[PDB]
Each structure stands twice: as C-alpha cells, then as structure tokens.
Write a protein that binds this DNA or RNA. Sequence first.
DNA 1: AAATTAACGAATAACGTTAAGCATTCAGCT
DNA 2: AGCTGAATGCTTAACGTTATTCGTTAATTT
Lengths: 95, 92, 95, 99
Amino acid sequence: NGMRPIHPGEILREEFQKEMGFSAAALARALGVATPTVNNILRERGGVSADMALRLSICLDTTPEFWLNLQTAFDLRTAEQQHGDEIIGSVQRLV
Amino acid sequence: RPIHPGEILREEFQKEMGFSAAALARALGVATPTVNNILRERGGVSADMALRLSICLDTTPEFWLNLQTAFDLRTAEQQHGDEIIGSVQRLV
Amino acid sequence: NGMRPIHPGEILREEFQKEMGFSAAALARALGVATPTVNNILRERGGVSADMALRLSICLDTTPEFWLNLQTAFDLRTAEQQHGDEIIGSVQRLV
Amino acid sequence: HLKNGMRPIHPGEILREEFQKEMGFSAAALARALGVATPTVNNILRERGGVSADMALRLSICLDTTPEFWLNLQTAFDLRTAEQQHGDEIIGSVQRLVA
DNA sequence: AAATTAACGAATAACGTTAAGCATTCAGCT
DNA sequence: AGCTGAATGCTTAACGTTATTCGTTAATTT
C-alpha cells in the first residue's frame, strides 16, 4: 500500500516498445490477433487475457505468468483504491 | 495437470473447517449462488472475491488469485496451446 | 475553458434513465441494437453515432439533433482542453 | 416533429463554394496553414472523407469563424445522409418508448 | 420436520474480430 | 517546375457476439 496501481500496458509500451520499436498493427499480426485487440492494452484499457499472456511469452522469451502476474496485481490495488473500503465492512472475519 | 478454482477451496477450507456456502455467503457479503459456483468448480472466481477471501481465511488476496491465473494458463495450455505455437511468430 | 466537457451519456443516464427508469439491456432491444453498444455510452466511453441519434429521437419523441448537438460540443472542449493549446500555435490565421 | 428526410450537404461542398474557389487558393498553402498534410485537406474538397473535430478548431482560426460552424453542418450531413439511406430500416426496428 | 444446495434467468461488463475513419510518403497532372 | 488526385500504413472508433455475477424458483436433506 502507498504506491501506484500499475497496468500491464505500462510495463509493455514504456518498457519493451521503447527499447525495440514495436508497431501495434505489425505487433498484432505478429501475435496472430487483430490490431484493436493489441492496441486496447496499449490504450491501458486492458485487459491481458490468459491466452494472450501465453502468446506474449513466446515473442519475448519470458514466462506467460510474467505478463499475467503484474496484470492481476493491478486490479487488486485498483479495486482496493476504488471500492476497497466498502467490502471490508460487510465481510466479517472467521477463526 | 492443472489446478481448479474450487479444488483448493473445497478440499482445503470448506471441508476441513467450516460450514457450507449459505453462511459463507453473507460472511463474504455476496449471495449464495456466487459462492457454491466455485465449489461446483465450473469457474466464477472474482478478482473482488480474492480481496474478500483473504479476510475470512487470514491469508493474502494474492494467494487465491495466483492459483486462479495459473488455472486458466494450464487448462488452455493443452487446450489452445498447439494452435498458439504455430500461429505466433517469434520476435527479437 | 470556459466550461467542463460534458458527455452524452451524462445527459442520458441522469436526465433520462433516472427520470423514467431505463435499463441498458431493455433500452438496447428498444433501440434495435446490442446491449454493449448502448452501455458503452452509459459507461461514457463513447460515443453517439449518426444512425443512433436518429433512433433515440423515436423513443424519446425529441429531435435527433438534440442528442447530436451535445455530442459535437463535447469533443470540442475535450480537444480544446486536451491538445487545444498546440492547435492554436501551429495554425496561422488567414484574411 | 416527423420524418422522413430530404437532400443533405457535405462540408467540402460548403468549402469549395463560398470559401475555396471564391477569394482563395488551394490545398498546398492551405495545408501548411492548417498544420496538416495536403492529402488530408483536398479530401474534403473532393468530399471523399469526413470533417475532423480537430480540424473544426483549426478552421475557425483561419476563417475567423466558430469551430462549431463547420461541425454543425457535418453532423447534419450524416444525419441527412443516413436519413433516406438506413432510414427505412431504423424506423421499423426501433419501437417508441414511454414519453 | 426444515432449511438449503443445485438449477434458471437477467443484469452488466468483459474480450474479441470486423469494418471505418483518419494523417505521411510515392505517383500523375497543370 | 510546379502542385492535386491516387496508394498504403498507422491508429482509433463502432459494433456485434460471446463470457462472468446476483435474484428467484425449485428440489433437496437428518
């Protein structure tokens, strides 16, 4: 707690895309998917699919869990920041 | 080879500790059908649930989500995996 | 500058959905379109189509220009406030 | 408060007449005046294309008019365009709501 | 004797592919 | 000695179709 809710397209576009110049359209067919599908993640609108993470790992010689792990961590502190306070009151802890 | 959402719940928490989904429902602040859907194991794991789930079970929310994403991954691995390797061309 | 930009779905969900109770799914089939198409306007992601505005006028017994006029006014002070400063510098006035 | 509609008019029609041919020169100088490339511009005089929202802000500047001017006739175009075009299909498929 | 788990059904909101709309860089005129 | 109409790429819009989440009835289970 106390840091930003970082999205996947942030660790994509400003990390990989900047080191080697990637074009969303060319990247799409490189991934075997339609352009908007790709560009919707670059638009930070998300999200990363599980089949998506699997294909990404192929291109980038990483593990598919890599692209998925930071993705889920986003939502957590997205919703934690959005409605997170509200769920705590309704839920009562168990032994 | 994969691990399901409800397999690590029903076989760990629901059976070896407490009572059934009805009481668990209002304890999690959601309706009953939402809960047993995971016990019925056909999917339905919320991201929002994990935040709620960590609370009852004194665990981290990250715990329940880590196996969740790993689920989709391993299921689809044999499922769409063959199609994925061929269609996707490697990058530098 | 001088006012905040206002989206169509704002003058929709508030003035209309709240005054007479609307439901995005039912409004969808009432408008002859798929639900997300409708709810994407309520989500204020945008945006109002020209064929759409014509459809709305039928349901709401208003003119189609009503829904379109506020649409164009939005983009105007969206872009005016976003990149608008950059536009003024690059454009040179004519007689 | 009734349809259906009649003949539309595009922005590039209201461009070449009243603005482009009268008192003025064409797309080469006009491009650089608007900060955009030539093809973007003549596409409207040729009427193949739409009127941008970003352009309307730029046109108001050159022609000492409001940006709303150019955008108002733009939507009226699409509305009137689609009015006879998809109009038959739209009236039938859409059923009026409580009002 | 009596809740309750499993099943229908609608809501919204994802993801996705498809199709259209937009500004640079080579070719054909004026 | 030019500059407008084509041809191609990018992105972003709009849309439809297809999946996950709560009410409510029905069947179950001491």
